[model samples]
Target chain A: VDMMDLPRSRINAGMLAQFIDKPVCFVGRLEKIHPTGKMFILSDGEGKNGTIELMEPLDEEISGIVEVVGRVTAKATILCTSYVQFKEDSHPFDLGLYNEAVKIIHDFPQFYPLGIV
Target chain B: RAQHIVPCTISQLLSATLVDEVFRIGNVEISQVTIVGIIRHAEKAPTNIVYKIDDMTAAPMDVRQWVDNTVVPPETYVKVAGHLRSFQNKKSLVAFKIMPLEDMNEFTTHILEVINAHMVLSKANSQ
Candidate 1:
């Protein structure tokens, strides 16, 4: 497997355990930052949660919903590689709707197949 | 036939499953596809404007708009609602509405929406 370039599968907290040690794209609300700053909690917006561990400090101060590209560890925390902050939407962000979509993608994985050459 | 405002990515727009201008994922008929991405380049004409949109896919896609004089500058994230058109043997999005992201979270939301569209559409498709 090429660490330089590998496909990152889109997944939510519910599917994190399935992709341990594999790269994945995680989108969620940055629910809280650990006082230690190296760790943070993410809410998929549907009650499920993802814990992330950063190797380096974030380039910028980020809050709200964000996309984090990282690899899942055996310890069940994501080791962050890249972080992209999402700006607030004009309207209230509907996390419930977002979480439902995430589930549907996992449920019907055939149509949403990932890892293209 | 139900016409859907599909949420999709650039790669999905360029899927090889197109049949006679009809776009589909498996048996799902995709219509009026929408995408969210950043504008990398732009060209303007008196009548229409063309944009190179990259939705973090395998390649950048060309999107054109007619009669809509407003242009979103390059590197700005936007949501494009359009139809896929094949003209002069090239596929591009002919956008009806090109709106900038008022709130950045919409960008992330759009990605999830794209995944949702494909899953739901194919499931609802008559197999």
Candidate 2:
């Protein structure tokens, strides 16, 4: 499939279950970074989060707002194409932003369907 | 779903002021509004680009721009001036212009404008 033609969905950890085999984008914090396994947990900061298995270890700190763009593998994990850590000093990553992000995916389930909340 | 032809804040845009599915902010009917936020996620389809934008007043909302040459990256701060559109109870912005901000101060300025606008409308509604 041409990469540009791929359907994209924005979702969070609680909503990850529905997009098992599709491309997804998530904005959250990098919780646990496992360098040995090239993986980490992406959290929405309210106990809702998911595992992101990267192609390589992220050479960044463990905390901060991270953007993950990749495919949701059959293994129930995100195989990331891009893992970006937004500048920590740029803005305060607050609940308002986090909830808004979550709401976008939740309200538009057809676009970011995670199966009814 | 009904439609409005005015502009409003992100909070008012998504608030309960909406009546019978018509977009109204504090009794002010709106059809178009300008919103500023960081693009959290951007998706490209064959016909258009869908951007999830958040100004922190409410949840991120999708801004759909018809397929064009302009490409805005995720995490970029942008000010979108667009028409307020809805389909099947879903609300979205049909962007006429999406401009990237070079100064971060613009972000704060935009949010203040939204809040001030909302307050003014709300006061008028109560009067």
Candidate 3:
């Protein structure tokens, strides 16, 4: 890993708004795929942690874990440039995994400078 | 360097297996896998080359190729035949054969092939 001014980081889904316009990644489950797949919701399964709106459709119906990589926009949405889907067998609905992902946001306290404990 | 290429995509690679931090496809613990993607990021070091690769599936993956023979730059489409390994709780691909892709058509076609492979495996398991 090279020392760069802004390295790509995997952020918690809830913390997306904090890093607007910056490249960030998040892990969640494909809860719903809207018509044409243009936009869908990615949640940590807990309904309250946070949900992400992926502005792109996946090649196929995805289950299990899905990773989204893209830039955060000013409108508090993730402009997905690419994604990786981990099928059900690999990463099932493990509460432990979901918690770990959500916990990532807390790790970067600098980003969530105001709220979020 | 492994022979036989097990065709896969970044999504397939990740969806294949996860058992105690290990990645596998079906019964086989994947020491090697073949994938194609566009390079998202690349950094060089004295011993190896690290890259962030994405096949437009989930998230870009960290692929590390030991400095031995080939060199692939960032932003180039590539086919990576490598081993799946983990370090510090993160999964990465250790490359065996990282080749540049010339035809853009190979991108979507390759993804279909990966999807087909996964379907085949699913069918086999169900039977």
Candidate 4:
């Protein structure tokens, strides 16, 4: 419960490099689950990719749009501390809209902190 | 030249203004707003229904909707569209529309909308 208080920065694939060793909350589409079963390749939905290294096997049903929160490893991969899959039926939370927010959040750091409510 | 239905968290709504009647963050005037959160409590009067919403912000926001008999169960995720108002010196939302969200992602979606709106409004100049 101690680490739960850590600030989780919301970031996209393009923003990963700036956050090595820092905690990030990244939302991406499930591109593929690596053969290792504990690893994943995610699409930022903008032609970019990110790798996720998990501590355990995911047992829940995935709905494609996934957000992973964890520390960015030295290897540029996410060491998943926690994650959630988003369900979409009407496309209300489309990747396009999510991308714009990511861009804005980083652009206006003073107004919208990366560790948002 | 019109005020935006700013999408924001409850903390932002409360932290927004000291000028009770008006809601603003810095220079951007927050008129109407949209919020997505979990219903923590619901109370209904003969003419209106009030629900306390928790968006994991600083505190829960009370949303007073004027017409509803089918009260949404507590702990349900919902999207509320309304404006800022005062009732007993506390800022509350007078909602025009309230919908229970079946998809949880929309919560984060509203947050994104909030950020996008702010970025746009920050560039606004009374035009």
Q: List the per-model TM-score of the A chain.
A: 0.83, 0.74, 0.66, 0.87
Writing each residue's lDDT as its tens digit, candidate 4 over A1-117 gives: 213444466678998899999877788888898666788877885758999998887766464788777789999999987665664666545676667767766776656543323
Per-residue lDDT over B1-127 for candidate 2, one digit per residue giving the tens place of the 0 to 100 score:
4443343445555552466765665455677788776787899898889998865344578899988366788878788899887777777889988888665445445544554554455466675
Stretches off by above 4 angstroms in model 4 are A1-7, A90-97, A114-117, B1-4, B9-11, B37-78, B82-97, B101-127
| Residue B118, model 2: Cα distance from true site in angstroms | 1.5
Better of 1 and 3 by DockQ: 1
- Order of candidate numbers by DockQ, starting with the best: 1, 4, 2, 3
Cα deviation at B44, candidate 3, in Å, is: 0.9
DockQ of 4: 0.14
C-alpha displacement of A91 in model 3, angstroms? 38
**DockQ class, candidate 2:** incorrect
Task: Give lDDT tens digits, candidate 4, residues B21-81.
Answer: 5667745688788888767689979899889886534456789889734999886779989
In terms of TM-score, how similar is model 4 to the real structure? 0.64
* Among all candidates shown, the one with the greatest DockQ: 1
Model 1 quality (TM-score): 0.67
lDDT of 3 by residue, B5-90 (tens): 55665555555557666555553345567777668788889898889886544467888877845457666778888887766767
Q: How far out, in Å, is residue A37 in model 4? A: 3.8
Q: What DockQ do you compute for every candidate structure?
A: 0.19, 0.04, 0.03, 0.14
Interface RMSD of each: 4.1, 10.2, 16.3, 5.0
Give the DockQ of candidate 3: 0.03
Worst 10 residues of 1 chain A by lDDT: A1-10
